[PDB]
Structures are given as C-alpha cells and as structure tokens.
Amino acid sequence: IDFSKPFMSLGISIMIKKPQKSKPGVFSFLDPLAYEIWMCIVFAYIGVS
Amino acid sequence: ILSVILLFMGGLCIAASEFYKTRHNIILSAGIFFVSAGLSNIIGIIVYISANAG
Ligand SMILES: CCCCCCCCCCCCCCCC(=O)O
C-alpha cells in the first residue's frame, strides 16, 4: 500500500509511575534521629536530673 | 533482671524503715536502690534496642 505523509510523529518513550509531592509531615523535624533515640534522650534527661 | 533485684531491695528498705524508725540511712539506701534500678533499666533498653538492629 502507499501511505500518506505522517499526520502524527511519534516514537518509543519511557513511562514510569508519576511520583508524589511527598508533603512533609508535621513532626518531621524529628526525622534526623530515630524514635528510639528521642525516647532514650527523655529517659536520660530524667535520670540525669 | 538487675532492675528487678534493685527494685525489690529498695522495697525491702522501706519496710525495714517502718520497724527501725531511728536508722535514717535505711531510707537513703532505698532511694539509691530506686535510682540505680532506673539506671539499670536504661541500659537494658539500650542493649535491647541495639541487639535487635542486626
Ligand atoms: C532535654 C531532653 C529532652 C529534650 C526534648 C526532646 C523532644 C523530643 C521528644 C519527643 C519525641 C518522641 C519521638 C516520637 C516521634 C517519632 O520520632 O516517631
């Protein structure tokens, strides 16, 4: 058959799952340390006092 | 388990205090037994959390 001129140029692309904006949590300033450290600091604080 | 033993020894001192109301270093021993039991508990918490991290 004899095609006509392309009316839509395309190709092979890459599709991935759209990511999320990862809205920071309210209490995210605690993230640098683990929950165990934060809990142990309170225990250490009480003990020292 | 040391905390459990240190807490038991502290409680024994409070009972003994009731009898020997003239020996004031028994109440002091109880206070040190209760403060050292809490410090033992702290170490146990840190040892438990640091041994389950593997
Ligand atoms: C002076 C010693 C204490 C200072 C104040 C530190 C405040 C942090 C304690 C609360 C945080 C507990 C952690 C639970 C939340 C989490 O990180 O998942």
From Swiss-Prot, chain A:
Species, as recorded: Rattus norvegicus
Annotated localization: Cell membrane; Postsynaptic cell membrane; Cell projection, Dendrite
Function text: Ionotropic glutamate receptor that functions as a ligand-gated cation channel, gated by L-glutamate and glutamatergic agonists such as alpha-amino-3-hydroxy-5-methyl-4-isoxazolepropionic acid (AMPA), quisqualic acid, and kainic acid. L-glutamate acts as an excitatory neurotransmitter at many synapses in the central nervous system and plays an important role in fast excitatory synaptic transmission.
Tissue: Detected in cerebellum.
Complexes and interactors: Homotetramer or heterotetramer of pore-forming glutamate receptor subunits. Tetramers may be formed by the dimerization of dimers. Interacts with EPB41L1 via its C-terminus. Isoform 3 interacts with PICK1. Found in a complex with GRIA1, GRIA2, GRIA3, CNIH2, CNIH3, CACNG2, CACNG3, CACNG4, CACNG5, CACNG7 and CACNG8. Interacts with CACNG5 and PRKCG. Found in a complex with GRIA1, GRIA2, GRIA3, DLG4, CACNG8 and CNIH2.
Part of the intact protein present: 511 to 559 of 902
Post-translational modification: Palmitoylated. Depalmitoylated upon L-glutamate stimulation.
Record-annotated membrane-spanning stretches: 35-49
Additional facts recorded: The postsynaptic actions of L-glutamate are mediated by a variety of receptors that are named according to their selective agonists. This receptor binds AMPA (quisqualate) > L-glutamate > kainate.
Domains: entry comment: The M4 transmembrane segment mediates tetramerization and is required for cell surface expression.
UniProt superkingdom: Eukaryota
Descriptive protein name: Glutamate receptor 4
Similarity comment: family membership: Belongs to the glutamate-gated ion channel (TC 1.A.10.1) family. GRIA4 subfamily.
Curated annotation (Swiss-Prot), chain B:
Top-rank lineage group of the source organism: Eukaryota
Transmembrane spans: 1-16, 26-46
Residue ranges of coiled coil: none
Subcellular location: Membrane; Synapse, Synaptosome
Cited function: Regulates the trafficking and gating properties of AMPA-selective glutamate receptors (AMPARs). Promotes their targeting to the cell membrane and synapses and modulates their gating properties by slowing their rates of activation, deactivation and desensitization. Does not show subunit-specific AMPA receptor regulation and regulates all AMPAR subunits. Thought to stabilize the calcium channel in an inactivated (closed) state.
Subunit and partners: The L-type calcium channel is composed of five subunits: alpha-1, alpha-2/delta, beta and gamma. Interacts with the PDZ domains of DLG4/PSD-95 and DLG1/SAP97. May interact with GOPC. Acts as an auxiliary subunit for AMPA-selective glutamate receptors (AMPARs). Found in a complex with GRIA1, GRIA2, GRIA3, GRIA4, CNIH2, CNIH3, CACNG3, CACNG4, CACNG5, CACNG7 and CACNG8. Interacts with GRIA1 and GRIA2. Interacts with MPP2.
Family designation: Belongs to the PMP-22/EMP/MP20 family. CACNG subfamily.
Name under which the protein is recorded: Voltage-dependent calcium channel gamma-2 subunit
Species for this entry: Rattus norvegicus
